Enzyme design. Structure first.
Site, PDB file in Angstrom:
ATOM      1  N   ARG A   1       0.821  -1.208   0.000  1.00  0.00           N
ATOM      2  CA  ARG A   1       0.000   0.000   0.000  1.00  0.00           C
ATOM      3  C   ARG A   1       0.857   1.260   0.000  1.00  0.00           C
ATOM      4  O   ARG A   1       0.618   2.185  -0.782  1.00  0.00           O
ATOM      5  CB  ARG A   1      -0.943  -0.020   1.203  1.00  0.00           C
ATOM      6  CG  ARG A   1      -1.796   1.227   1.354  1.00  0.00           C
ATOM      7  CD  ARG A   1      -2.619   1.168   2.629  1.00  0.00           C
ATOM      8  NE  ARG A   1      -3.299   2.428   2.899  1.00  0.00           N
ATOM      9  CZ  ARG A   1      -4.510   2.734   2.455  1.00  0.00           C
ATOM     10  NH1 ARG A   1      -5.217   1.881   1.733  1.00  0.00           N
ATOM     11  NH2 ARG A   1      -5.027   3.924   2.748  1.00  0.00           N
TER      12      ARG A   1
ATOM     13  N   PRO B   1      -6.363   7.894  15.144  1.00  0.00           N
ATOM     14  CA  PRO B   1      -6.828   9.287  15.190  1.00  0.00           C
ATOM     15  C   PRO B   1      -8.045   9.490  14.299  1.00  0.00           C
ATOM     16  O   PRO B   1      -8.029   9.144  13.116  1.00  0.00           O
ATOM     17  CB  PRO B   1      -5.620  10.079  14.677  1.00  0.00           C
ATOM     18  CG  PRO B   1      -4.450   9.132  14.817  1.00  0.00           C
ATOM     19  CD  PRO B   1      -5.033   7.789  14.528  1.00  0.00           C
TER      20      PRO B   1
ATOM     21  N   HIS C   1      -3.872  17.327  10.210  1.00  0.00           N
ATOM     22  CA  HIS C   1      -4.778  16.640   9.290  1.00  0.00           C
ATOM     23  C   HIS C   1      -6.185  16.515   9.881  1.00  0.00           C
ATOM     24  O   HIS C   1      -7.187  16.819   9.217  1.00  0.00           O
ATOM     25  CB  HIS C   1      -4.170  15.272   8.957  1.00  0.00           C
ATOM     26  CG  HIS C   1      -4.939  14.466   7.957  1.00  0.00           C
ATOM     27  ND1 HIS C   1      -6.092  13.780   8.269  1.00  0.00           N
ATOM     28  CD2 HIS C   1      -4.696  14.216   6.648  1.00  0.00           C
ATOM     29  CE1 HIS C   1      -6.530  13.148   7.194  1.00  0.00           C
ATOM     30  NE2 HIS C   1      -5.704  13.403   6.195  1.00  0.00           N
ATOM     31  N   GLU C   2      -6.277  16.096  11.146  1.00  0.00           N
ATOM     32  CA  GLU C   2      -7.585  15.922  11.771  1.00  0.00           C
ATOM     33  C   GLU C   2      -8.229  17.260  12.115  1.00  0.00           C
ATOM     34  O   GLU C   2      -9.458  17.375  12.094  1.00  0.00           O
ATOM     35  CB  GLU C   2      -7.472  15.046  13.023  1.00  0.00           C
ATOM     36  CG  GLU C   2      -6.913  13.638  12.789  1.00  0.00           C
ATOM     37  CD  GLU C   2      -7.868  12.687  12.087  1.00  0.00           C
ATOM     38  OE1 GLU C   2      -9.074  12.991  11.986  1.00  0.00           O
ATOM     39  OE2 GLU C   2      -7.404  11.622  11.629  1.00  0.00           O
TER      40      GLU C   2
ATOM     41  N   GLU D   1     -10.816  14.097   2.412  1.00  0.00           N
ATOM     42  CA  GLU D   1      -9.445  13.734   2.747  1.00  0.00           C
ATOM     43  C   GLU D   1      -8.431  14.737   2.201  1.00  0.00           C
ATOM     44  O   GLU D   1      -7.382  14.943   2.825  1.00  0.00           O
ATOM     45  CB  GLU D   1      -9.143  12.325   2.242  1.00  0.00           C
ATOM     46  CG  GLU D   1     -10.227  11.316   2.586  1.00  0.00           C
ATOM     47  CD  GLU D   1     -10.036  10.701   3.959  1.00  0.00           C
ATOM     48  OE1 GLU D   1      -8.931  10.834   4.524  1.00  0.00           O
ATOM     49  OE2 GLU D   1     -10.994  10.089   4.476  1.00  0.00           O
TER      50      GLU D   1
ATOM     51  N   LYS E   1      -0.632  -6.798 -12.002  1.00  0.00           N
ATOM     52  CA  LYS E   1       0.359  -6.251 -11.076  1.00  0.00           C
ATOM     53  C   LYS E   1       1.724  -6.114 -11.737  1.00  0.00           C
ATOM     54  O   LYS E   1       2.445  -5.138 -11.492  1.00  0.00           O
ATOM     55  CB  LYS E   1       0.448  -7.113  -9.818  1.00  0.00           C
ATOM     56  CG  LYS E   1       1.298  -6.489  -8.721  1.00  0.00           C
ATOM     57  CD  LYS E   1       1.355  -7.365  -7.488  1.00  0.00           C
ATOM     58  CE  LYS E   1       0.068  -7.307  -6.685  1.00  0.00           C
ATOM     59  NZ  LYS E   1      -0.120  -5.979  -6.041  1.00  0.00           N
TER      60      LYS E   1
ATOM     61  N   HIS F   1      -9.773  -2.304   3.346  1.00  0.00           N
ATOM     62  CA  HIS F   1     -10.855  -1.619   2.642  1.00  0.00           C
ATOM     63  C   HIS F   1     -11.653  -2.568   1.757  1.00  0.00           C
ATOM     64  O   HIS F   1     -12.882  -2.464   1.677  1.00  0.00           O
ATOM     65  CB  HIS F   1     -10.288  -0.469   1.810  1.00  0.00           C
ATOM     66  CG  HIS F   1      -9.533   0.540   2.614  1.00  0.00           C
ATOM     67  ND1 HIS F   1      -8.192   0.409   2.906  1.00  0.00           N
ATOM     68  CD2 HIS F   1      -9.934   1.695   3.195  1.00  0.00           C
ATOM     69  CE1 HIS F   1      -7.798   1.440   3.630  1.00  0.00           C
ATOM     70  NE2 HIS F   1      -8.835   2.237   3.819  1.00  0.00           N
TER      71      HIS F   1
ATOM     72  N   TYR G   1      -8.565   7.440  -2.544  1.00  0.00           N
ATOM     73  CA  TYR G   1      -7.166   7.782  -2.308  1.00  0.00           C
ATOM     74  C   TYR G   1      -6.511   8.348  -3.562  1.00  0.00           C
ATOM     75  O   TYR G   1      -5.711   9.284  -3.473  1.00  0.00           O
ATOM     76  CB  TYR G   1      -6.396   6.567  -1.792  1.00  0.00           C
ATOM     77  CG  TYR G   1      -6.968   5.999  -0.516  1.00  0.00           C
ATOM     78  CD1 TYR G   1      -7.071   6.790   0.623  1.00  0.00           C
ATOM     79  CD2 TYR G   1      -7.397   4.678  -0.442  1.00  0.00           C
ATOM     80  CE1 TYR G   1      -7.590   6.288   1.797  1.00  0.00           C
ATOM     81  CE2 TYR G   1      -7.918   4.164   0.735  1.00  0.00           C
ATOM     82  CZ  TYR G   1      -8.010   4.978   1.849  1.00  0.00           C
ATOM     83  OH  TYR G   1      -8.523   4.487   3.025  1.00  0.00           O
TER      84      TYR G   1
END
Ligand SMILES: *[C@@H]1O[C@H](CO)[C@@H](O)[C@H](O)[C@H]1NC(C)=O
Ligand SMILES: *[C@@H]1O[C@H](CO)[C@@H](O)[C@H](O)[C@H]1NC(C)=O
Ligand SMILES: *[C@@H]1O[C@H](CO)[C@@H](O)[C@H](O)[C@H]1NC(C)=O
Ligand SMILES: *[C@@H]1O[C@H](CO)[C@@H](O)[C@H](O)[C@H]1NC(C)=O
Ligand SMILES: *[C@@H]1O[C@H](CO)[C@@H](O)[C@H](O)[C@H]1NC(C)=O
Ligand SMILES: *[C@@H]1O[C@H](CO)[C@@H](O)[C@H](O)[C@H]1NC(C)=O
Lengths: 596, 99
Positions: free
Chosen positions: A255, A328, A356-357, A384, A463, A487, A497
Site C-alpha cells: 500500500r 486518530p 490533518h484531523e 481527505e 500487477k 478496505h 485515495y
C-alpha cells in the site's frame, strides 16, 4: 400544496429528527471509542439499529415524492440521496446473508492470527506483531514466510466468502438500476442536471486512465530507483530487468513505500528535518501541538476551535485502566459538536496527524450551515484532500522555522529537498498504481469481465503490467490475495485515495497561487495568507450543496481532475531520477526473471 | 437530553405580532386530510430541542426575556426610580419636592 413544498417540509422534518438521532448514534460511538466497555457496545448497537431503522423509514417515505416535479437543485439532491434503496431492494434472506458475510469478514480480518508452523504456543495478530516485522526486517525468508502464511490463511478463509460477496453485491447493484457494484461506487462522482458541469459514471474510468498514463513515467523512474536500491540491499534476489518481489516493499500489501526510506535514501550523510528532539527539549505537550495547529488555522483566516472542542476532545491516551481506540479520528457529532480522538505522542507524525484531523474538523465546521443530508464533501476525495493539504503545509521547513521548532541556521540545500521529495513520493506516488490496479481489478470483477476461475491469473498479470511487482511463487485460485487488505474486505471504495492524491496537489497549487509564492511548489507555505484561506473557505462552506466539478472550478479553475500539479510538485525529483537512471534501465519486464 | 422545551415547526400562515399558538393540531402539508394521524404528508407541529450540555454555542439553550414598553391613554404607573439628594437646610438651594 405542490409536490416540491411537500418534499421541502418532509426534508425539514427529516433533517430535524435526523440531526438528533445521528447525534445520539455518534455520541454512543464516541463513548464506545473513548471507553471500551460492554454497556457502551450495547448502547452503540442500540443507537445504530435505531439510526438504521430511521433511515429505512425515511427511505420508505421519501420515494413517494417523484423527482421530475422538483426544480430546486438542493431539494432534488437531498431527495436523490434519501431515495436510494441500499440493501432494502434485495430480499430479506439475501440481505441477511450479505450482512452476515460482511460481519464474518470483519471478524476474520480483525481476529486473524498467524504464526510459524511447529511453534504454535503464541501467535501475533493482524497489526502489531506483523506490522513491525514487515516495516523493519531485512531478512528475505522471514518476510516471505509472513507474507505467504498470512495470504494463505486469510485467502483460504475469504475466497468462498468473496465469491458469495461479489454475486450478492452485483445482485443488489443491478436491483438498483446500476450496471455493477463498480457503477454503484462510481455513481458518487455522477453529476446530473447541471449545464456544462455534468459528470458521468463512465467518464471516471477514462479520466483515471488518462491521469495514470501521465503518472506512469514518474512511477517507472521511481520503480527503477527503488529496484536498484533493493538490489543493493538484497544482492541476488532482484533482477535488473524484472519486477520487484512482493514481500520487500516495506508494508504487508504494498500500500505504501514509506518504510523503504531508510534503504533508498539518496544522501544519508546529510541530516533529516526531524523536530522531535526540539519539542522534547522545549517540553511540548500535545495541548501545545493542537494550540500551534489552531494558530496555523487562524493564521490563514479560518475560524478557531470552539470551547466544546477543548472541553470534550480526548487528545491524550487515558491510561492503562481505561481502554480506547488509538486511531486518530475527527468526529462531527452534530449540533455544532466537533471533537478529535487521538492518542497524541510527541512526534512529527502525530503533529502532522493533528493538523490533518483539525483540517477535517475545519471542513466539518464549514458546512455546518448546510442542511443535514448535505453535510458532506462534494465527493469522497475533497474530505481527505483538505486534511492532506494541511499535512503538506505543516510539514514544510518554513513552517517549522516560523513556529520555532526548527533552528534558524538550518541549511536548506537541494539535497534535503530531493530526499524529502523522495520520501513524499514513496508515501504518495507509490500508492497510486496499487490503488488504480486494485480498483480496475474490482471493477472488472463486478462487471463480469474476469471469470471466477481466472481472477488471479489476470491479477498478477495486472500487477506486473501496472504496479511492476512480481509474485514470489505462483498462486492458484484457492488464494484470495486482494481481500487481505482492510478496505476491500470490509466493503469500502478505494478510488478515494487516487482522487485525494490528485486533489491534494491541485489544491496546493491553487492555494500557493493565491498566496503568491514565488519558488518551488514543495517550498510553499499557506500560513499568514488571508486570501488563500478565503478561497479555501468559499469551497469549504458549500459542502455537498454544489457539484464537485463546480467546486473544483471555484478552487483551481478547472472542470476536471488534473495530473499536472503532482508532476510539478515532484519535478526537481523527476529531473534527479532521470539523471540517476542513465546507466540503469527504466521500466520492467513481466517475465519471471527475478524469482518465481 | 432535555425534551421539555418545544417549538412550533409548521403552520399554514405566519403569526401576528404578540400571538401565542398552543394548538396541537396535525399540520396538513398535502391535499389528503390528516384525520388526526401523523401519516404521509401530515406532521406534528411541536418539535423538541434535545438540549444537551455538550452542544455548540449556537445550539446551547438561551433564556430570553423580552420587555415591551407601551404608552396608553391611561395614567402611566410603571415609573423608573428617582434619586434623593441629601437634604441641605438653612441655605439658598434649588428644591424639587415631588415635582
Ligand atoms: C469509563 O467507563 C467506566 C466503567 O463504568 C467508568 O467507571 C469510567 O468513569 C469511564 N471513564 C470515562 C472517562 O468516562
Ligand atoms: C432551494 O431551497 C433552499 C432551502 O429550501 C432555498 O434556500 C433556495 O433558495 C432554493 N433555491 C431555489 C432556486 O428555489
Ligand atoms: C427502490 O426499490 C423499489 C422496489 O422495492 C423501487 O420501486 C424503487 O424505484 C427503488 N428506488 C429507486 C430510486 O430506484
Ligand atoms: C476564538 O477567537 C475569538 C476571537 O478572537 C476569541 O474571543 C475566542 O476566545 C477564541 N476561542 C478560543 C477557544 O481561544
Ligand atoms: C545541488 O547543487 C549543486 C550546485 O548548485 C550541484 O553541484 C549538485 O549536483 C546539486 N545536487 C542535486 C541533488 O541537485
Ligand atoms: C504568521 O503569523 C504569526 C502570528 O502573527 C507569526 O508569528 C509568524 O511569524 C507569521 N509568519 C511569517 C512568515 O511572518
Amino acid at each position: 400544496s405542490t409536490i416540491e413544498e411537500q418534499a421541502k417540509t418532509f426534508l425539514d422534518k427529516f433533517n430535524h429528527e435526523a440531526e438528533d438521532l445521528f447525534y445520539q448514534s455518534s455520541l454512543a460511538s464516541w463513548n464506545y471509542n473513548t471507553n471500551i466497555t460492554e454497556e457502551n457496545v450495547q448502547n452503540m448497537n442500540n443507537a445504530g439499529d435505531k439510526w438504521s431503522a430511521f433511515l429505512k423509514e425515511q427511505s420508505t417515505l421519501a420515494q413517494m415524492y417523484p423527482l421530475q416535479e422538483i426544480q430546486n437543485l438542493t431539494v432534488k439532491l437531498q431527495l436523490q440521496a434519501l431515495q436510494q434503496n441500499g440493501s432494502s431492494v434485495l430480499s430479506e434472506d439475501k440481505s441477511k446473508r450479505l450482512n452476515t458475510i460482511l460481519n464474518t469478514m470483519s471478524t476474520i480480518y480483525s481476529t486473524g492470527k498467524v504464526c510459524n508452523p511447529d511453534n504454535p504456543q503464541e501467535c501475533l495478530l493482524l497489526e502489531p506483531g506483523l506490522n513491525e516485522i514487515m516495516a523493519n526486517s531485512l531478512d528475505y525468508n522471514e518476510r516471505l514466510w509472513a507474507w505467504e502464511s498470512w495470504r494463505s490463511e486469510v485467502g483460504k478463509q475469504l475466497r468462498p466468502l468473496y465469491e458469495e460477496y461479489v454475486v450478492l453485491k452485483n445482485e443488489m447493484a443491478r436491483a438498483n438500476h446500476y450496471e455493477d457494484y463498480g457503477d454503484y461506487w462510481r455513481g458518487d462522482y455522477e453529476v446530473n442536471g447541471v449545464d456544462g458541469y455534468d459528470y458521468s459514471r463512465g467518464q471516471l474510468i477514462e479520466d483515471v486512465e488518462h491521469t495514470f498514463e501521465e503518472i506512469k513515467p514518474l512511477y517507472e523512474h521511481l520503480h527503477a530507483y527503488v529496484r536498484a536500491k533493493l538490489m543493493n540491499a538484497y544482492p541476488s534476489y532482484i533482477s535488473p530487468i524484472g519486477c520487484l518481489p512482493a514481500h520487500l516493499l516495506g508494508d504487508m500489501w504494498g500500500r505504501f513505500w514509506t518504510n523503504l526510506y531508510s534503504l533508498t535514501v539518496p544522501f544519508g550523510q546529510k541530516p533529516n528535518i526531524d523536530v522531535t528532539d526540539a519539542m522534547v527539549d522545549q517540553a511540548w505537550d500535545a495541548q501545545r501541538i493542537f494550540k500551534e495547529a489552531e494558530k496555523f488555522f487562524v493564521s490563514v483566516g479560518l475560524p478557531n476551535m470552539t470551547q466544546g472542542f477543548w472541553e470534550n476532545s480526548m487528545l491524550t491516551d487515558p491510561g492503562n485502566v481505561q481502554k480506547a481506540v488509538c486511531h486518530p479520528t475527527a468526529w462531527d457529532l452534530g449540533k455544532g459538536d466537533f471533537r478529535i480522538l487521538m492518542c497524541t505522542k510527541v512526534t512529527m507524525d502525530d503533529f502532522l496527524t493533528a493538523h490533518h484531523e483539525m483540517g477535517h474538523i475545519q471542513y466539518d465546521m464549514a458546512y455546518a450551515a448546510q442542511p443535514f443530508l448535505l453535510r458532506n464533501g462534494a465527493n469522497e476525495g475533497f474530505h481527505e484532500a483538505v486534511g492532506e493539504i494541511m499535512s503538506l503545509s505543516a510539514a514544510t521547513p518554513k513552517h517549522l522555522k516560523s513556529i520555532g521548532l526548527l533552528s534558524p541556521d538550518f541549511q536548506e540545500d537541494n539535497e534535503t529537498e530531493i530526499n524529502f521529495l523522495l520520501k513524499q513520493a514513496l508515501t504518495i506516488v507509490g500508492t497510486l498504481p496499487f490503488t488504480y490496479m486494485l480498483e480496475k481489478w474490482r471493477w472488472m470483477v463486478f462487471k463480469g469481465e474476469i471469470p471466477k476461475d481466472q481472477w488471479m491469473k489476470k491479477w498478477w498479470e495486472m500487477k506486473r503490467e501496472i504496479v511492476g511487482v512480481v509474485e514470489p511463487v505462483p498462486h492458484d485460485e484457492t488464494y484470495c490475495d486482494p481481500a487481505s487488505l482492510f478496505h476491500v474486505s470490509n466493503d469500502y471504495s478505494f478510488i478515494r485515495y487516487y482522487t485525494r492524491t490528485l486533489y491534494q496537489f491541485q489544491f496546493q497549487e491553487a492555494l500557493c497561487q493565491a498566496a503568491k509564492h514565488e519558488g518551488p511548489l514543495h517550498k510553499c507555505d499557506i500560513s499568514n495568507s488571508t486570501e488563500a484561506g478565503q478561497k479555501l473557505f468559499n469551497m469549504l462552506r458549500l459542502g455537498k450543496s454544489e457539484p464537485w466539478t463546480l467546486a473544483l472550478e471555484n478552487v483551481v479553475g478547472a472542470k476536471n481532475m488534473n495530473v499536472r500539479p503532482l508532476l510539478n510538485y515532484f519535478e526537481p525529483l523527476f529531473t534527479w531520477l532521470k539523471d540517476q537512471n542513465k546507466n540503469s534501465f527504466v521500466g520492467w519486464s513481466t517475465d519471471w526473471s527475478p524469482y518465481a | 437530553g432535555n425534551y421539555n422545551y418545544l417549538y412550533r415547526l409548521f403552520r399554514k400562515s405566519n403569526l401576528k405580532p404578540f400571538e401565542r399558538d398552543i394548538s396541537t393540531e396535525i399540520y396538513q402539508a398535502g391535499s389528503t386530510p390528516c384525520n388526526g394521524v401523523k401519516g404521509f404528508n401530515c406532521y406534528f407541529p411541536l418539535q423538541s430541542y434535545g438540549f444537551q450540555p455538550t452542544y455548540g454555542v449556537g445550539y446551547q439553550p438561551y433564556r430570553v426575556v423580552v420587555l415591551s414598553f407601551e404608552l396608553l391613554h391611561a395614567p402611566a404607573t410603571v415609573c423608573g426610580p428617582k434619586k434623593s439628594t441629601n437634604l441641605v437646610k438653612n441655605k439658598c438651594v434649588n428644591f424639587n419636592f415631588n415635582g
